[PDB]
Amino acid sequence: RTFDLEEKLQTNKYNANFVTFMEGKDFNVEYIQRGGLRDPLIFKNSDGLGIKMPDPDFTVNDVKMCVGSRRMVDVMDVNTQKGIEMTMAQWTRYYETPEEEREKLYNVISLEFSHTRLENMVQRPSTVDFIDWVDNMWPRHLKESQTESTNAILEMQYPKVQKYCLMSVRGCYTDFHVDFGGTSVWYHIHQGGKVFWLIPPTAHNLELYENWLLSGKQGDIFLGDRVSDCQRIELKQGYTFVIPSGWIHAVYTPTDTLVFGGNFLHSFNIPMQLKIYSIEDRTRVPNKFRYPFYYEMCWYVLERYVYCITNRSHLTKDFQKESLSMDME
């Protein structure tokens, strides 16, 4: 890394106001139908969101115990933005290490904990449940068949991207990126805090981003300096943040923090979702860092819309029977 991160946190140049501050009760389906979820949102308190979180004092060791000591976890080497692997037990030992004794800065942002004990301790915003393509479009019997709690692709019966735990030590940085498949995102700051840089997905910015990615020169170029309008904003303990499709962001961790969040696709910004997919195609992103079964899901979306509206099914007979049996429950 060739730019000074400490200057990026102090300057006032990132002064756009993209984020809308909202009350939980106002974040409903009608709000989504009206605005199409185009604006980033911050809920300074959880009231009215329908979220559920663990005990405020829940630790990384409690996470370990819920998901398994031997579970392999994807870790990010902050200095290089490369990825490595270690068991959750090793991750925990690192995280419990005093700050001065940590040799490297490491970050975990990709621990998907669905189908573990922890899954039920965290509930998403109700509104996301109403619109998430996974919950509303993927054949339910496949989703319910999932047994595996890691993200092993051969075991994966549906796009396993709904519930993540993020564990970040003081000084962690995640460089500019758009979330996979053009997913939208919700993040709840359980303990600690985060600083985000936000860049809107205008055609010009998305062209810059794609160019910046093909350049290979992302350690050297701070992308918020190459755009017209960027917002730096801090999230405090207890806040919830929603990031729309395609928004380009980077994240800094000022204090040891624990976040629960997830990804979702939905039906009100499909064009942007498709744009980001094909940016991934062009920049040659390994399949592992992508939304699993993207187009498969897209097919199922078409079928759901036709069916709910016209009552003509284009699912196989077996799939129709599987579905009817779920409706009988």
């Binding site: 990709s110 990615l213 992302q218």
Partner: peptide, 13 residues
């Protein structure tokens, strides 16, 4: 090494 999917990470430098 089982192949995974749905890993959140930006491009490496």
């Amino acid at each position: 090494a089982p192949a995974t999917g749905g890993v959140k990470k930006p491009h490496r430098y």
